[PDB]
Structures are given as structure tokens and as C-alpha cells.
């Protein structure tokens, strides 16, 4: 029943005793439920050392991975240039699912199309879809720039991509002119930030391969920035901010901030800002190019330093304090410009900000999750605040990567007690939690499950989320924050000593109990 | 008016490639409630046309995602590399009772996570092993089904000779699934090879066991994923009604009650669409009648409970009427807070393959007005009940592509537009309220009387917010 | 006992056994406590209706104040002025405190001398004490300025600070020149934004009321920004963003941004920013000038029309975003410039991120409390919102004040559940969260302990504070934030939302218990 | 280097005036600890000069912040304006165990927030029916005291009149307590006069009362306020040695505790600044003897532990013994980890009347120097204690102005600075590690052995903090 005046959804209204009563009954009449008792002993046994030890022991079953496929990351990056339609070569399942999970991150369209390849294209390939698809794209949704992906299915069955783009010029389905870089996207390779390094590298070659003669290093005297697989839009703004706080002169290479980010003034746009295609024709000409997430960037590196003689340097990506000033100090090196006394204030706010929250940040011990080089950056940014990277985890990091977070560790007294797991799923993370419990986990949306998992076991044992990274779908709007520089460091300090006081005062709440330490004053 | 709506749709084809623009010219109609069949007015469940941006779904989404996905105390593995599980973990709101990790594993993904020695070898022989590891960490499991993705039947894998020899090695239920995305045109042929492999896998297993005892008054829900709760606020009227609802196909499902329902006396199916394949073949094996119904408002649901009741005995039939008059003045009480706020709005549906018609007695019983409606993937026989449900001369379209969507709404001008995730954020910009009616935007129950109440406070909400005055500068 | 590697500190050290029983037997011992059964049965009853009605006929005792007194309005109005020096004439005790009571919200030195008056100024007054403190201040701290405001003593027995201050320049104890403005700041008349009001107003009169000869209205193009007593960084800076971002030629009267955010780079900046004594002296000049909380500048608004004669526009607080809209527009028309396309665009975001969060907001139920400008503002823009604001208090609110906020309730269906209430304090606001219970306080940190005596009562009872005003002292950095303009409605949604969906989830994260509605997706 | 010590007070004096310059020079001394009186080098308890930015605070705070408003079980109206009781209001991290609000009120501001007509016509009426309303709505407590701010006695209010009058009113102890700001030159008054309110209004409440049951053992911790649980940290040491500890003066004290401390055999006294008023007293009217101790430390609580022991029999120098060898390990373990860390680290001190001398010694178990101390409102018989426990030719200051301790600082370079809120947040900007030793920064405790592995940790974890290494910009 309801009563009108305060109506009651799934929760509270399941709780109800009618609807109680009726679940037990449906329980004990025709579920077949192992009892209570089993549950418990079984869920007990998943939390121990002796679970743990088998849960690492997988090698062909995989349980709540931390990465998605390629196609997501080449449409992300298809994105951020201007008036271009990211489009999916295969079949058109993919595509509902790219855009619903960008819908859900960023809630805003996301626009995407696929050319629907079915069991008759698996039988004759997908020729037919292209040369049709890329006709009625064009003519129905006005890009000025179409960038194929691929799908699995397209894969497997060796879709000549370049050929079939090729004849639906020749015949005539699109001018020969219009752009539609391409690139192999297959999703049983790497993860979604291969896809963006792979869709990002076929951009830059469609604009700057067969026209390199009469291109001049440094003639423009910019910097070119790659920012990699980036769904923080305060990343893309602080790092244009930072620069034009320097008065340098750059390209952003894939900038989907606009389109991510349109007002609601009653007209939906399908495009807004991006990328030109003048800017990709022209990188060239700069004096060198930045890649601010290069441990998925191997392909675009190879590339730019190959074919457009690019002296890419060696930066981390620009995370916490150290870094932060390493990437203003190559950007001044590379640029002439000097550090401007604006952004020295700045990076001195950080630091008045570590010495106010250090007493509450030491020694606190976190397991975290991510891509690459967004998990390395938070790695290095916890050392520097003094914090203990217990757990740290990257489904879809490499040998060369575990490598250099390791020395990282090895550098700081705060890494003797870190370990760095590649290729492990969060399943695996969850037995860690448990038998190594850390006080939070950073990571993202899949974590409340774990905590969830680490609540059932007593209160004593609950690991808070703390949500950073991608997805985050079960809060709003934190995708306009920022990681990068000391805006994000900020932010990131911020949240981290906000949440141990958040937790504290939820363990001191108790009254007679435990609020002797429920102080006004932290 | 008619022409108007006619002339509207000519107007929209004008933007196409000639291919394109006669295929999209069957799909699109002005209604008619007179004609006796659909397929002379509108053509249904065909490919997409390429490049269009269809919001179409695939097979797996069919089968994995909707029918097999919800059933709570089964593993089910997503087979093939690891985009297709991750994307859809927990995005549907299948709800259920369980210990999750434990004795329910509907929220998690397992997944083969297809690597390239995996597509050039086969991944059968990681499949059994996968398996093995499964049984280990999970031995509370009560069977497992493989969800195929695009790559195992394109490069050869028989997943089914791996179900049966593990399945017999380990004597447990494994049920080998080809929903790959590339069969079918949508996710509408992923219901159908679901429901196939319940009947050939799960569905037969007691056809001998003559251990539980049947009720004259034993029904099975088929059709209900238990969004946000619906077919708990189901059951609870129909067993108030006196009936014992033995099986949940699939929301909250369990398999044993699945192995459970060849035992019940009448099936009652929702989701036409997703479950009439498997009713028709209860009905051909074991003679077990079934009837569509309709839980969306008071009008609906007190229809669909009078002719469920009057399939069984006097006494059915007398809780009906007392279920009826014990609810009668919560869901009045509804209508009298509601009605007045939401009389008259004009609304514009899009969605799946049921609830573009079945939810259109729910607007109108706080007089709303369905001025269109269309469907992903219905069938000839879905949009045959849709012609009678909708108005004379509104509008109707398969398959709606992105841009006409968006133009149909710019001339239509509805007041709300009920559709989905992906269609969300472009509406709202434009500053028309939208509510998603496949997730209900987080909220629900819908379905039977205690959903009516929440799906009426969610459409005032959101039509009639204070936002939607704000989106104009007042400089312009 | 410790155990070396895994120390604890208060919490959870107390929670030993051996500590545990210690405090019993001190309790029984010798504490002579009522039974736990008669104090049980007293919070029980400090929670009913019955005794609600009891506290709300109080006459005479307050009980957790909502408000402080003037001269830390007074401290607070001086910072905001280049090189100058806040000097509370009076007894140190309370220049201990107001320095105190920043440093705890703000992170950050907060620097305001004593004349130490005692036992000896109470009987002759605090004459001595004037001419010895501002020759020591001036030669040992060299500020610019000293401005001077006054303890309940030093009212009380009466000094005439006109008269000490024009003795110490006659008697040579300071130059005649140097600038010491003054104001009579009495702790029992009003509230800590009165100390304001009468600073600012006392500044603004010492360098302009025998000057006003040769100034015109308009000449300098300006237009002057009054920002009253304000504790978020981000405020000062959202104005002084917003008016630079349309091109309006602007001057900030009271200005503390710098001071109160200096950079840790080795150096103590005792002062740093702030209005200079030409902006004040060239402030009659202006095209008119804008008070950004105009409910505690009362007195400065009848100086600033009476003498520079400024037609001072009816603006609300610029929060939310009608009063923002409104604010942008009366700048635009009195400076002549246009509200540029950036700022178009922001208004858009916020209003798409209302669209994005209004179906979690709609009809959530907020306690909320602080001064009458703020507090005004929150219920607009939560009456925006679609929320209901059902207990609003402001202790230091007046008749007029409750009259107009009253009728913006009025205004729209959302505020017809809401009451106003004027000179109630916290302990009257904690029964009301027990009698009439929302689903939120708002409020600053003194509401931790309403969150402490809900919960006491059960869980179902608890109401979650989310910190907005001031102080907030336990927890870091939020006076970094901001409540203003279109970015501050932006941070007040997003976290009004994500707080709303913490507590759901906290809600629904009981396995097989409630976490059937623990979404993934919100 | 003494001469060079006194190089800097004359250099640091050369910006006053003549008249601030001569007094202040009598409140900075180089060290000499063979002096036999310290007023011979440094003169103390003085007035602050006007306009120096003294730290100090008023007798309010060492009135009501200190002294009365740790008592739990009682309820301390803050007579005045509003201001003193806000700012004043949970500073102060004195612990207790409690239903406040219920039975416990000591984190609450109560007060009469005057107003110009309370200023004007007297503030003893209002005060009047503000006790009728505090009994009404607070029932449980167990006495009344008034705080009494500035204007108090400005105004010539009769407090006592309304304190004996409404007492035998309502038959509860109601203290008036004239602490207003204005008396005396700091905190220090404060608590000789809150002392002298104790004894004149509560202590002798049970002189005529032989009921309590009297064991040889029986103490009185007197001036520890559990900063942090201070008091708990060494309550248990006195009571594992075979003591009863009876009362805590005053943190999470009771008033019951009071007036049953004549029935005490042995006052132990920590903070002599404080209490060391009220000590006298008790061994006048009751005869009860008292000696100071020092739980600051493991040299320290090692020595107060077996003086105390001292004063009683061999059973409890036995019990003694078995502590010091119960806790030896646990220290020796703090020791060997955080000693290394610490070791010939130079740490400079500046605090109120206690704390300057008695943290000397902890922190040479950890292998630190004090090379410079100072208090707000120490009198010279707390400096007479001081220059014993600190090395020669460092740096004593009294009310130190804000000008010379930056300026001490900046020559003398620490290693860490251990001061409270109003300095805290300069010395960071200098780069200079800072502890807060008035709260503690949120820790603690720092009494006893327990307190002790806290205080270590706590000293280490910011002088060897990273950040501290970050100050200048790679760029300058
Ligand atoms: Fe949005
Ligand atoms: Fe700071
Ligand atoms: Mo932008
Ligand atoms: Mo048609
Ligand atoms: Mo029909
Ligand atoms: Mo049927
Ligand atoms: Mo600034
Ligand atoms: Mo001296
Ligand atoms: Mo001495
Ligand atoms: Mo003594
Ligand atoms: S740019
Ligand atoms: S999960
Ligand atoms: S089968
Ligand atoms: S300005
Ligand atoms: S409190
Ligand atoms: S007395």
C-alpha cells in the first residue's frame, strides 16, 4: 500500500511487512535457498587467506574487471574533434553500449554511429555497410569529419578498412575529399586507452602523412598536447588555463570539453568546439609535442617522434606537486616562457594546504584502481602527502609499468609496504581488502561493492569508497572536477583528509560511547 | 491532423540518400486504429540502416542483458573479450533478493576476457577451465550459463560440446547461449534464442520429478525483470488475489522455481514480446494456458486482475473484487493529487518492444495524452495491439533513428518524452521534461497499484519542475 | 597499553578493557551519576513536543548561540585593507578569541592587536592604553592603517575613541597623518555582521565625509562591490571573476583574499592584497555601488547614499540563479557592458545540471541556519531546486527580514511547508529536527552535535549535517569554496545531490537486507 | 652562545619605543640555571604592553575555559555578551564521559547574551529566570555556575545575591564566579579566582559528613584538565600502583568528585600554575598534603611514580615497581623507533603556565633539545622550576609579543616548534615544523606511557614530514 502524502519507493516500501512476509514465502516455496547458515560460512570463507590464495590462483576466469574495450576509448577520442561523428565499423551492440556508458559518466549526449553489420556482413564481410553508412551519416548528421573505428566482429572477419573506405569514394558514396581517418580497434587487444592511442595515432596520420615536405619544426611556435583517455573535464581546462597563464602558444589534440559540456538553453548540439582539422594539418610545425598520459600514448610516441621529428620528452603525467613542476618547468624549457608568478602562488597554496592537512594524512594506508597513468600519478601524489599506497591495481597495466611504480615505491619510505598488481581484476582487489585492510580505497563506482562486500563482514571492517577515476555513474556532476596540476592536487587533498574526518566523526558519533573524541575542532 | 502528420514525415525523409529514405518511409506511419493488420501500415524487425544512429541494442543485450542476466542464483559468463560484460554490469535494474558474491551473483561480471591467442586458438579450452575456477570460488553457484559474444561464433568455438562434457564432469546445469551480437538485427532474436535455451537446458530437468505438488491457483509471472521492484508489486496482488505464484521469469528468478513453473496452472505474460516463445511452448508440451495482462494503473491493472480471476473458481474471484476495493482509495487518492497537475500534457514515447503501448492507459488515467510512440525492436504482432491502444491520426515509428526523433519532437512539441539513456540528455537541453521508462530514472516500482502512486509523483516532478522555466537568459 | 608498530590515540586507545572498566569504577566510585534508565528517559523526553513548547519559552537563557559578537565583524571588515592593522580597543581576552576563531576556519595567521585594557583603564579609562598601543602597533607591526574597534568594556565605562585617538596624534604618539579610522563595535547590540557594518562604514567615513567637494558620481567608471562579513575564499573571487570577465571597472571595499590565502614558500606575509586607502578615497567617484548582502550593511548603505549619494541598487544576495541573473543584469546596465557569451554559457551549465540532479533534489527536506543574507539566499535557490526548506533560522535575523523571506516562500509551492524563525538559537532548532524532522541540516559545524543527539535517538532519526556558513572547523578547506554566482550554486547543488545519494547508499548497503536498491547508476 | 643569545633580545628590542623597550627587556632572559631565584633575571605576571600582539587571554578563559567548564555534571552559564561563550565553546579538548545535553553539558554554550537593555537596567533579573529555565529544561544537573564576562561587574550586577537567593530557592549549588576579562593580566588570575570559587561555594559541602568510606590509598589527580585523555592515560598508572584515584580536577571531573576531596590522603598535583591555590588550601583546613608530579615522558613518569609510591607503604612501592616493569618494554620500544628520528633535533617552546617546563624531559627521551621556552602567564615561582630544567644560555621569554618570537625564530632556526592556534599557522609559512602543545593538533594523549608512544609518534610524523621539503619552487 501506499499512503499518497508520502509515497515510498523500491526503498523504504519493500521493507514493508506485507512485502516482507510475501518474500519469504516466495523464498522458502520455490527458491531452493541454501540456508542462512551456508551463506554465512561461505561468504566468511571468501574473506580469508586461504580464499585469497585461490582467487590469484585464476588464469581463465575473470570477475569484475577494471577496463573496458578499445572502441570506447577511439570514440572518446573521435570526439574532441571538431564537428566529427565518431563512427564504429560493425556491429551496432557496441555502439549502444559506448554511448549509454558516456551517458552515464558525463550525462550528456554522446553521439555515435555504427553501420549495423549483421550475420550476412559475417558471411560477406561489411564493404556494403561501409560504403552506405558513411553516405548516410554524412548526409543525415552534417559532420565535416567521420573517424572509423572497428568492432570485434569486424576484426575477426579481416574488414579491409582502408580498401572499403577507399571504394565508397571511388563510387562515389562520399567526396573524395571528405576526411574519414580510420583505425583498428580490436577489442580482444589491451583496453580502452588502446583505443584512443590507436584512433588518435590514424587522425594524425590522415592529416600529416603524405604532406610532411614542407613542414617546419617550431614554425609555429607552439607545444602540441595529446591529453590521452580523459573523462575529468576540469583536466582538459587546467591544463589550457596553465598554459595561457604561461602566454604559451598550443594545440590541444582532441578536446572534446565543449561537446561534454553544453548549456541546457533549449537547443541541443550535436557538435560544440573540438580539435580543427587546420590544427591537426598544422601540429607539424610545433616546436614539440607534450603527451600528458604516456603509458598509453606508445603508438602516437612512435609516430610523432618517427614522422613528425618530434623530441617528445619524458614526462609523468601531471599529477601532485613533483610532477606538476616538472611539466611547467619542460613547458618553460620548451616554450621560453617563464614561470609566472600567478602559478607559483598557486603551487605554494598546495603546499600551505599539505602542511594544514599532514597530521591527518600520515601513515593512512589506501588500496586504488585505474588506468595507468592516473593510478601512478595518485600513487606518487599519496607518497608525497606521506600517505601508504597498500593495494595498487591496474587491470590493464604492463610489466614496463609495474616497473617504474616500483622504484617509484622504492624511493619513498611510504612504499614499503605497496605492492602493484597488473592484470588483476577487482575481484582480486576484494580478497586484498579484506586480508590486508586498508583505511579507503580510491577508485571508482565498481567499489561500492566492495565496500559493501567489506561492510557485511562487521563495521569494523568496511573500507570507505572514495570515487575517483571513471566510470563514476551513483554520484553527480564529479566529472567536472579535476587530477591534473596543483588545482587537482588541491582537490585531491581535499577530498582524502574530508574523508578520514568524515569517517572519524561517523566512528565517534556515539554517545557515552565513543564521543569523548567527537571534537569540534579538527 | 492527419496530412499534417504525413506531410511531416515526407518532410523529415527529405534529408536521406534515396536507399535510406525508402526503407525509412516503412517504418514510419500516422496511426489507425481501424486497421485489422499492422504490417499494412507500418513494417517492423528489420536490419537498421547503416549510419543512421539506431538505438538499437544487440542480440547478447537480448539475451545476457534481459532475459538470462537477472536470473539470481546462476553464474553467467560473458564469452568473448571484455567490453560487452563491463558495459553492461548492473545497468539494468533487475532487482532481487540475495547475498551477493555468495548465493546471488546477478550485479557482478565474469567474463572470459578474450585476449588475441584466445581468438586465434578458440577459448573452449579456457572455457573449461574458467569453469573449474568458477566451481572453486563460487561453489554456491546453482549452474552456470555462457553468454556468447560477438568473436565465439565467428571463429568456430562449440561451446556447447564444452556445457555438455564439463556439465557432466561436474554434474551441475551449464547452459551454452549464441546470442552474439551479429545474429539477429536487435536485441529482440536475443529473447527468442534465450528463451530456446531454457527450453532445451533448464526447462525440462523435472519432468519426472513428481515431488512437488501443485495448487489450482498456481500461476507463473513471465515477462517481469523486476525493474526497481515491479514484479514484487505484482505478486503481492495476485497472491492478495488468492493465487500462488510459483515462478518470476526472470526478475528476482531463481532457477529451481524456473524448473518449477512446467507445474502451474496458468501463465501470465507481461512482456509479450521477450516471453511469448517459451508460453507458446508450455502450452504445446505440458497444456499450460497463458494470458497477456497489463499491471500499468489502476485502469489496467484492475482489467488484467478481473481476467486473470475469471480463470479460476468463485472464490478467486471474490478476493479479486476485495484486492480491487481495498485499493481503490489509495490509488483515487492518487488520481485526485495528480490528475488535476498533469491533465491535458501531451507525451511522446520511445522504447523497447512491451511499454510503448503498455504503459499508455497508466498516462491517460491522469489524463495524459500519447500523441506518438514507437519501438526498438517490436514485431507486426506487437505494433497489431499498438493500433488499437493509440489514438486516430497520432504518430508511430520502428526503429526511429536519431535525427527523427529529434525532428519529430521539434514539430510535435510534447509536453514530456519517455524514452532512454541515450535520449535523455538531448531532450533535456531542449528544455522538454524527460523521464527514462526503461531504468524509471532510479525510481519505481511502476508496475500493479503501489507502483501507479510513485510513477504518478515521478511524472509531476519532472514535467512540472521549476527548471524547465530557467533555460532562457532573461537578456535572451 | 601500546603496542609500538599500531599506536592508537584517543580514539580507539580509551576502548581497551583495561580503560573501559577503569571509567566504570570512576563512574560508580565516585561520580554519583543519575541511572542510565533516568537518563535514558530524559533524552527521550528532551526530543517530545511537550518539551519542545517548554524550550520554545525561553525568555532568558540561549543555548548554542547561532551568532558572535560585533568587533569579530570588525576584525574580519579591517583585514580586507592593504597594510593594515585590526586594533580592538579593550581587553586582550577577546582579540585572543576573534584571532583564534578565524585561525580555526580559515588555516591561516590572523594578525589584530590589543590595548590590554584592565583592572586600572576600568576605574580611568582606557586612555593610557590608546596612546601607548598605537605607538607600539605602528612601530613594531608598521602597518599602513590601524583600525580600531572596541570591546563590551571598553563601551561600557564609555572611552571617547575620537578623543584618544586625536590626543595621541596632538601628544606625538603617532603622525598626524597617518589614518586611523574607528568605530564603537558593542558586543550586546547585534551580531558579528553589525561589527562589520560599523567598521566598514567608519572607514569609509574617515576618507571621505570632509572630502566630498571635488568627487562626482561617475567619474572614475567603477563601480564599488561591498562584500560584508564573508568566509569563503571563493567568493571574492567569483565576484572579482565575474565583473573582470564582462569588462566592468570595478573596486572591492574590503578585500581579504590575499591575506588570508598566502602561499607557504618560506616567507610569514603579515600582510598581503587589500583594498588600498586610494580606492577608498576615490570610491565616492563611482558609478554607484553594489552591496552583495545588504541585510547587515545597513548603516553603510545610509552613508553611501546620504553623502556620496550612490542610488544603491535593490539587489538581493547574488545566489542561486535568479539573483545571480538579476545581479549580472543591474551591473550590465549601470556599467554599460554587455554579459559577455562566457558567462551566458555558465548560466546554461547550472541550469543543465539542475536538469541532471532535480529528480533526486524534488522534495528533500532541509533544516538550515547562519546569517540573513546567506541563510536568504540558500532558501532561494533550494526553493529553485524544487527542495523544502521546512526549518529556517537566523538568530541574528530582524522583523523586516523574516517579513521578506516570508514572502519569497510565499512565492512558490516548495516553501509552504517552511517557517522563519528570528533569535532562536540551536538547542531551539535541535527540536524541531526531532518534532518536525527534515531530511538535512545545512549549517555550520556547531549542527555536528544535532547530527550526534538525532542519531542518539536511533538511526531512523538521524539527520545528516552538509556544512555550508561559517565556522566550519572540522573538516579542511572548504573555505576555499564557493556560494555565490552561478559557480557557487553549482558546488552547493552538487554536493546538496551527492549527499543526498551518500546517505542512500549508506542506506542500502545492508546485504540481502536493503542493498537490493544499492544502484550502480543514479 | 650566551653572548650571542644576548645580542639578539637587545637587536629584537631596538624597534619599541623607549617605554615598551625597558619593560620588555625585564621579561627576556639568556638562561642561568645556578641562579637560586629567577627574578633576578626575568620578571613575570606582568601587565602586557598595549598594541604588542600579546598571546595571552583573559581571566574568562582560565575561569570557564579552563578550570570550570571541564566539570561535567554541571552546567556554566556564560554571563554577558555573546561573544566569550561562542568563542570559548568546545575549544578546549577536555575529555569526558557523558550524555551531554542530558547529563553532561560541558561541549554547550549556555549564556545570557546581553543585550543593551541587560547593559542599561542590570542583568539580575534576567539571570534570575535564566536559572528557572536551566532547571526546567536541564533537570539533571547537578549544579549552577555564572562565568561572569566583562561587563558584569562594570555594570555593578549583584551575581552572588541572585547565587544565594535562587540556591536556597531551588535547593541546588549555584556559583557566582567573578571572573570578569578585565581582572588581573591574563588566564592566571582566572584560576586563582575559579579556586577560590570552588572552596568559597562547593568544597566544604560534605565537611559535616564522616559517611564516605576512607582507604589508606586515596589520591586527587589536581590539575590535569584530560587534554585529550590525559588524565585517563594516567589515572590508570595511579590506580595499577594500588592507588584510588577519588577526583580529577577537573577534567572529566565530577561535582561529586570535588566535595569528596577533603576525604583524600594525598593531593597529586600536576598543573601547579592552576591549582596549586586550592592544594594550599586543603592542607590548611583539612591537613591533606600535596607535591607536584610529571607524567610528561617515561624519565619523568618513572620518577613522579616512585615518589608517589613514596608516600605510602611497601605494598605500593611494590605495585610501583611491577608498573615501571610492566611498561619498560613499550617505552623502550617507542624509544628505539622514533629516538633515531629525533635525536640532537632543536625544538622551541612557547605555552602557558605548565607545559614550558614539564614537556622538557619527554622530549629528551627522545633525544631533542628545548634551546627556547616561555610562558603566557607563568609566575616566578613556575620560572624558578624552569631555569633547573632547561640548559644554559638558552632563551627564556615572558608574554612574548608576536614581533620578538618570529624574530627569535628567524635567528635561532628550530627544528620544530611546539606553540598553539594563533602561531601554528606563521611558522608553517616559514617552513618550520609546528606542533600545537595546547591541544595537542587533535591528538594525544601525551600523559604517561601511553602518551608518550602518541607525543613520539606525533613528533616525528611532522618534523620528518615530506612536505616540509617542498617549500621553494624548483624555479625560485
Ligand atoms: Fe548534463
Ligand atoms: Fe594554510
Ligand atoms: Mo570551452
Ligand atoms: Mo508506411
Ligand atoms: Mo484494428
Ligand atoms: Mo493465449
Ligand atoms: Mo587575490
Ligand atoms: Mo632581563
Ligand atoms: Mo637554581
Ligand atoms: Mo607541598
Ligand atoms: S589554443
Ligand atoms: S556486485
Ligand atoms: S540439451
Ligand atoms: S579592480
Ligand atoms: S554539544
Ligand atoms: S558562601
Not at chain 1, 606521506?386 to 612504499?415: F, M, T
Not at chain 2, 530437468?205 to 525483470?225: C, L
Not at chain 2, 531463481?254 to 516463445?277: A, D, F, G, Q
Not at chain 2, 533513428?401 to 532512454?420: A, C, H, M
Request: charged content about 25%; some cysteine; overall charge negative.
Amino acid at each position: 500500500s501506499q499512503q499518497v502524502d508520502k509515497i515510498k519507493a523500491s526503498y523504504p516500501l519493500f521493507l514493508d511487512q506485507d512485502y516482507k512476509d510475501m518474500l519469504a514465502k516466495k523464498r522458502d516455496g520455490f527458491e531452493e535457498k541454501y540456508p542462512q547458515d551456508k551463506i554465512d560460512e561461505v561468504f566468511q570463507w571468501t574473506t580469508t587467506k586461504e580464499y585469497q590464495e585461490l582467487n590469484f590462483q585464476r588464469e581463465a576466469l575473470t570477475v569484475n574487471p577494471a577496463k573496458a574495450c578499445q572502441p570506447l576509448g577511439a570514440v572518446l577520442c573521435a570526439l574532441g574533434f571538431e564537428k566529427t561523428m565518431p563512427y564504429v565499423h560493425g556491429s551496432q551492440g557496441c555502439v549502444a553500449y559506448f554511448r549509454s556508458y558516456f551517458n552515464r559518466h558525463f550525462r550528456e549526449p554522446v553521439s555515435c554511429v555504427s553501420d549495423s553489420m549483421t550475420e550476412d556482413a559475417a558471411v560477406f564481410g561489411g564493404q556494403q555497410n561501409m560504403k552506405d553508412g558513411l553516405q548516410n551519416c554524412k548526409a543525415t548528421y552534417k559532420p565535416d569529419m567521420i573517424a572509423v573505428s572497428t568492432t570485434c566482429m569486424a576484426e575477426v572477419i579481416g574488414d579491409d578498412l582502408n580498401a572499403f573506405i577507399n571504394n565508397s569514394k571511388k563510387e562515389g558514396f562520399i567526396p573524395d575529399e571528405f576526411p574519414v581517418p580510420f583505425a583498428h580497434t580490436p577489442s580482444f587487444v589491451g583496453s580502452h586507452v588502446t583505443g584512443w592511442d590507436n584512433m588518435f595515432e590514424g587522425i594524425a596520420r590522415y592529416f600529416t602523412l603524405k604532406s610532411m615536405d614542407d613542414k617546419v619544426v617550431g614554425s609555429n611556435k607552439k607545444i602540441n598536447i595529446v591529453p590521452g583517455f580523459e573523462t575529468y573535464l576540469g583536466n582538459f581546462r587546467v591544463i589550457k588555463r596553465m598554459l595561457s597563464e604561461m602566454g604559451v602558444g598550443y594545440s590541444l589534440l582532441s578536446d572534446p570539453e565543449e561537446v561534454l559540456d553544453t548549456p541546457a538553453d533549449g537547443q541541443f548540439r550535436m557538435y560544440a568546439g573540438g580539435t580543427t582539422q587546420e590544427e591537426m594539418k598544422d601540429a607539424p610545425n610545433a616546436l614539440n609535442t607534450v603527451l600528458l598520459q604516456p603509458w598509453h600514448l606508445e603508438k602516437t610516441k612512435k609516430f610523432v617522434e618517427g614522422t613528425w621529428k618530434h623530441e617528445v620528452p619524458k614526462l609523468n603525467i601531471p599529477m601532485g606537486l613533483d610532477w606538476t613542476d616538472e611539466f611547467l618547468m619542460k613547458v618553460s624549457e620548451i616554450s621560453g616562457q617563464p614561470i609566472p608568478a600567478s602559478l607559483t602562488k598557486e603551487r605554494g597554496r598546495l603546499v600551505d594546504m599539505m602542511t594544514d592537512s599532514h597530521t591527518w594524512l600520515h601513515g593512512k594506508r589506501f588500496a586504488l584502481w585505474g588506468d595507468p597513468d592516473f593510478v601512478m600519478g595518485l600513487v606518487k601524489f599519496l607518497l608525497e602527502l606521506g600517505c601508504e599506497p597498500v593495494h595498487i591495481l591496474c587491470h590493464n597495466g604492463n610489466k614496463r609499468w609495474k616497473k617504474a611504480v616500483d622504484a617509484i615505491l622504492a624511493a619513498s619510505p611510504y612504499g614499503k609496504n605497496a605492492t602493484v598488481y597488473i592484470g588483476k581484476d577487482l575481484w582480486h582487489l576484494r580478497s586484498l581488502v579484506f586480508t590486508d585492510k586498508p583505511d579507503f580505497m580510491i577508485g571508482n563506482s565498481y567499489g561500492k561493492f566492495i565496500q559493501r562486500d567489506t561492510l557485511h563482514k562487521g563495521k569494523e571492517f568496511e573500507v570507505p569508497l572514495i570515487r575517483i577515476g571513471f566510470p563514476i555513474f551513483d554520484r553527480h556532476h564529479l566529472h567536472r572536477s579535476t587530477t591534473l596540476g596543483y588545482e587537482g592536487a588541491m582537490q585531491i587533498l581535499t577530498t582524502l583528509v574530508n574523508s578520514i574526518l568524515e569517517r572519524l566523526d561517523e566512528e565517534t558519533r556515539g554517545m557515552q560511547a565513543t564521543d569523548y573524541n567527537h571534537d569540534l575542532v579538527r | 491532423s492527419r496530412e499534417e502528420v504525413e506531410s511531416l514525415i515526407q518532410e523529415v525523409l527529405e534529408v536521406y540518400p534515396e536507399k535510406a529514405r525508402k526503407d525509412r518511409n516503412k517504418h514510419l506511419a500516422v496511426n489507425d486504429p481501424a486497421v485489422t493488420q499492422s504490417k499494412k501500415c507500418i513494417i517492423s524487425n528489420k536490419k537498421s540502416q547503416p549510419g543512421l544512429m539506431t538505438i538499437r541494442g544487440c542480440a547478447y543485450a537480448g539475451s545476457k542483458g534481459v532475459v538470462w542476466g537477472p536470473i539470481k542464483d546462476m553464474i553467467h559468463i560473458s564469452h568473448g573479450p571484455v567490453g560487452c560484460g563491463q558495459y553492461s554490469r548492473a545497468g539494468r535494474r533487475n532487482y532481487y533478493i540475495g547475498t551477493t558474491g555468495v548465493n546471488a551473483f546477478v550485479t557482478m561480471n565474469f567474463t572470459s576476457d578474450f585476449q588475441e591467442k584466445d581468438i586465434v586458438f578458440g577459448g573452449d579450452k579456457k572455457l573449461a577451465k574458467l569453469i573449474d575456477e568458477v566451481e572453486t570460488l563460487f561453489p554456491l553457484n546453482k549452474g552456470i550459463s555462457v553468454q556468447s559474444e560477438c568473436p565465439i561464433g565467428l571463429i568456430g568455438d562449440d561451446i556447447e560440446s564444452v556445457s555438455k562434457v564439463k556439465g557432466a564432469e561436474l554434474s551441475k546445469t551449464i547452459v551454452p547461449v549464441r546470442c552474439e551480437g551479429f545474429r539477429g538485427v536487435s536485441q529482440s532474436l536475443g529473447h527468442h534464442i534465450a528463451n530456446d535455451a531454457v527450453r532445451d537446458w533448464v526447462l525440462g530437468k523435472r519432468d519426472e520429478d513428481t515431488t512437488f505438488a501443485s495448487t489450482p491457483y498456481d500461476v507463473a509471472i513471465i515477462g517481469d525483470y523486476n525493474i526497481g521492484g515491479d514484479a514484487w508489486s505484482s505478486r503481492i496482488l495476485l497472491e492478495e488475489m488468492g493465487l500462488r505464484c510459483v515462478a518470476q521469469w526472470s526478475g528476482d528468478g531463481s532457477i529451481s522455481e524456473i524448473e518449477l513453473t512446467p507445474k502451474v496452472k496458468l501463465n501470465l505474460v507481461h512482456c509479450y514480446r521477450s516471453m511469448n516463445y517459451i508460453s507458446r511452448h508450455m502450452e504445446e508440451k505440458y497444456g499450460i494456458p497463458w494470458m497477456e495482462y497489463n499491471f500499468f494503473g489502476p485502469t489496467k491493472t484492475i482489467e488484467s486482475l478481473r481476467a486473470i480471476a475469471a480463470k479460476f473458481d468463485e472464490s478467486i474471484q471474490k478476493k479479486c473484487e476485495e484486492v480491487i476495493a481495498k485499493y481503490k482509495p489509495e490509488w483515487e487518492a492518487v488520481v485526485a493529487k495528480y490528475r488535476p497537475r498533469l491533465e491535458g500534457k501531451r507525451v511522446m514515447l520511445y522504447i523497447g518492444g512491451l511499454r510503448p503501448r503498455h504503459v499508455i492507459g497508466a498516462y491517460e488515467d491522469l489524463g495524459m495524452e500519447v500523441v506518438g510512440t514507437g519501438y526498438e525492436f517490436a514485431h507486426n504482432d506487437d505494433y497489431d495491439r499498438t493500433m488499437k491502444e493509440m489514438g486516430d491520426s497520432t504518430l508511430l515509428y520502428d526503429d526511429v533513428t536519431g535525427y527523427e526523433f529529434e525532428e519529430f519532437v521539434k514539430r510535435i512539441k510534447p509536453d514530456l518524452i519517455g524514452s532512454g539513456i541515450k535520449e535523455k540528455f538531448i531532450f533535456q537541453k531542449m528544455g522538454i521534461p524527460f523521464r527514462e521508462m526503461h531504468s524509471w530514472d532510479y525510481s519505481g516500482p511502476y508496475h500493479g497499484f503501489d507502483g501507479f502512486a510513485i510513477f504518478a509523483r515521478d511524472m509531476d516532478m519532472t514535467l512540472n519542475n521549476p527548471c524547465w522555466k530557467k533555460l532562457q537568459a532573461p537578456w535572451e
